[PDB]
Amino acid sequence: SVTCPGGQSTSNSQCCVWFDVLDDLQTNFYQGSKCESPVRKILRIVFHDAIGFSPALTAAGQFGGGGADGSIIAHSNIELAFPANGGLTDTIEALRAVGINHGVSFGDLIQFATAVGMSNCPGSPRLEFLTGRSNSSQPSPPSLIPGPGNTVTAILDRMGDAGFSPDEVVDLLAAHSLASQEGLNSAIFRSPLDSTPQVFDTQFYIETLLKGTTQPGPSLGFAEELSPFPGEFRMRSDALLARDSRTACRWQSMTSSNEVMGQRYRAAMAKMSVLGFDRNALTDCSDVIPSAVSNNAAPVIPGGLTVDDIEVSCPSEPFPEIATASGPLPSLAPAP
Ligand code: HEM
Ligand SMILES: *[C@@H]1O[C@H](CO)[C@@H](O[C@@H]2O[C@H](CO)[C@@H](O)[C@H](O)[C@H]2NC(C)=O)[C@H](O)[C@H]1NC(C)=O
Ligand SMILES: [C-]#N
Ligand SMILES: [Ca+2]
Ligand SMILES: [Ca+2]
């Protein structure tokens, strides 16, 4: 049966090399299987790699990008000069070394390191993992990565061209539940985007909907909005997407069930992992990905705030009854 040298069982012999890069990533890149900055930086990288894909550029006779091809590593010299790719160089070099040492393609390595990093974060779904993407890539065209100062129309058009519906854009944003910022306001380095930057949960959707009350740093940084409590950072595109009529009802439905959020995110990520590829030409090695520990906490409106403090923006469905916490307002420490 396909037994790999280490004695694990898998579906196909092409999956066996991935048990070795699992060990290396967990011990080294993830510093003992932790859910800290390397996982958050890999999640920006998989998005920035895969979104360099534009059918409208191809239609106009231009190169439109190869999608999830590892071009952000193979052509980092040109892609890391793009505005959205700051604070990624160290992570890209660590990944380059693993790819070269294990003989796997860069596009596959990024997808694999995303599924493995998320498995270290409580509450995460098991992401699908496909292997076989060609290692050959051309540099991504510029201006294909949505930025935090863009309007909701600009973001939905860019994501729509890549292939995502407005609903899938909200689903994909569940990754900001494991997030902080470093380059928008350097004065409050690693300020989290929700109160549990180490748990994949619904808190990001709940807390971006809360009324912006607090300025967390000495000044406001690029595309920064008032947040609901000390230490939390709120990005303008996230504030706008939570409130815009085209995305507000899907954003609201993501607040009460970690289970629904996880399924929707896993589906949207599987679609993003094969942009520029035919998934029927890839081999499924999903059984190499381990289970994350379960998250047993329930969704809550933190620190004494109530439903009266969230700015309900979906005019059709009433806000879900979420639990409240009898606390003083929290102050978040930097994400680890
Ligand atoms: C509407 C599109 C989105 C925009 C405009 C956006 C923008 C940003 C920006 C400006 C940052 C802060 C980076 C920094 O200063 O360090 C950030 C962080 C982050 N984003 Fe996004 N994002 C979006 C979608 C996504 C998606 C789809 C994913 C991946 C599936 C993602 C994953 C992350 C993660 C995990 C971080 C945290 C980085 C860290 O803590 O080091 N983002 N995003
Ligand atoms: C994937 O392609 C890249 C080239 O784009 C290869 O990367 C180079 O690998 C050699 C040795 O294998 C290194 O000395 C170079 O420094 C690498 N270049 C870059 C830009 O990183 C990589 O080896 C290829 N991988 C496979 C398995 O074919
Ligand atoms: C996010 N980039
Ligand atoms: Ca790419
Ligand atoms: Ca969270």
SS3 annotation, the chain: CCECCCCCECCCHHHCHHHHHHHHHHHHHCCCCCCCHHHHHHHHHHHHHHCCCCHHHHHCCCCCCCCCCCHHHHCHHHHCCCHHHCCCHHHHHHHHHHHHHHCCCHHHHHHHHHHHHHCCCCCCCCCCCEECCCCCCCCCCCCCCCCCCCCHHHHHHHHHHHCCCHHHHHHHHHHHHHCEECCCCHHHCCEECCCCCCCCCCHHHHHHCECCCECCCCCCCCCEECECCCCCCEEHHHHHHHHCCCCHHHHHHCCCCHHHHHHHHHHHHHHHHCCCCCHHHCEECHHHCCCCCCCCCCCEECCCCCHHHECCCCCCCCCCCCEECCCCCCCCCCCC
Decide: 95 in ligand 2 pocket, CB within 6 A: no
The angle at the Cα of 130, spanning 84 to 283, to the nearest 5 degrees, equals 150
Short-list 132, 49, 110, 68, CA closest to 274: 68
- Report which residue type is found at 330: P
Q: Which of 69, 72, 80, 100 to mutate to test the pocket of ligand 2 (most atoms within 8 A of CB)?
A: 100
d(CA 217, CA 232): 10
- Report which residue type is found at 83: P
CB-based contacts of 97, cutoff 8 Å, min separation 6 = none
Q: Which residues are annotated as a binding site for Ca(2+)?
A: 49, 67, 69, 71, 177, 194, 196, 199, 201
Decide: 44 in ligand 3 pocket, CB within 6 A: yes
Evaluate whether 113 touches 38 at the Cβ level (below 8 Å): no
Domain 12-145+269-296 belongs to what architecture?
A: Orthogonal Bundle (1.10)
d(CA 86, CA 17): 31
Please report the atom of ligand 1 found closest to the CA of residue 190: 40
Six token digits for residue 71: 């071009």
Evaluate whether 141 touches 58 at the Cβ level (below 8 Å): no
- Whether 12-145+269-296 and 146-268+297-336 share one fold: the answer is no
d(CA 202, CA 309): 17
Beta bridge partners of 192: 180
Domain limits, the chain: 12-145+269-296, 146-268+297-336
88-165-121-213 Cα dihedral, nearest 10 degrees: 80
Q: Which of 37, 40, 44, 208 to mutate to test the pocket of ligand 1 (most atoms within 8 A of CB)?
A: 44
The CA–CA distances, whole Å, from 178 to 37, 39, 44, 228 equal 9, 8, 11, 18
Beta bridge partners of 9: 3
Experimental method, per PDB record:
X-ray
Is 48 a known active-site residue?
yes
> 150-158, long-range: CB within 8 Å, 24+ apart, which pairs?
150/237, 151/240, 152/237, 152/240, 152/241, 152/244, 152/246, 152/247, 155/237, 155/241, 156/246, 156/247, 158/51
Please report the atom of ligand 1 found closest to the CA of residue 39: 35
Point out the catalytic residue in the list 40, 41, 44, 48. Answer: 48
Rg of the chain on CA atoms, in Å: 20
d(CA 167, CA 174): 12
Ligand nearest to the CA of 140: 4
Say if residue 112 is exposed, middle or buried (CB neighbours under 10 Å; 0-12, 13-18, 19+).
buried
Evaluate whether 285 touches 309 at the Cβ level (below 8 Å): no
334-144-171-280 Cα dihedral, nearest 10 degrees: -120
Instruction: Tell me, rounded to whole angstroms, the distance of Cα 315 from its chain centroid.
Output: 28
- Beta strand 300-301 pairing with 323-324: parallel
Decide: 34 in ligand 2 pocket, CB within 6 A: no
CB-based contacts of 168, cutoff 8 Å, min separation 6 = 159, 268, 271
Instruction: Give the residue whose CA is nearest to atom 2 of ligand 3.
Output: 44
Evaluate whether 242 touches 251 at the Cβ level (below 8 Å): yes
Please state which CATH number belongs to domain 146-268+297-336: 1.10.420.10
Decide: 96 in ligand 2 pocket, CB within 6 A: yes
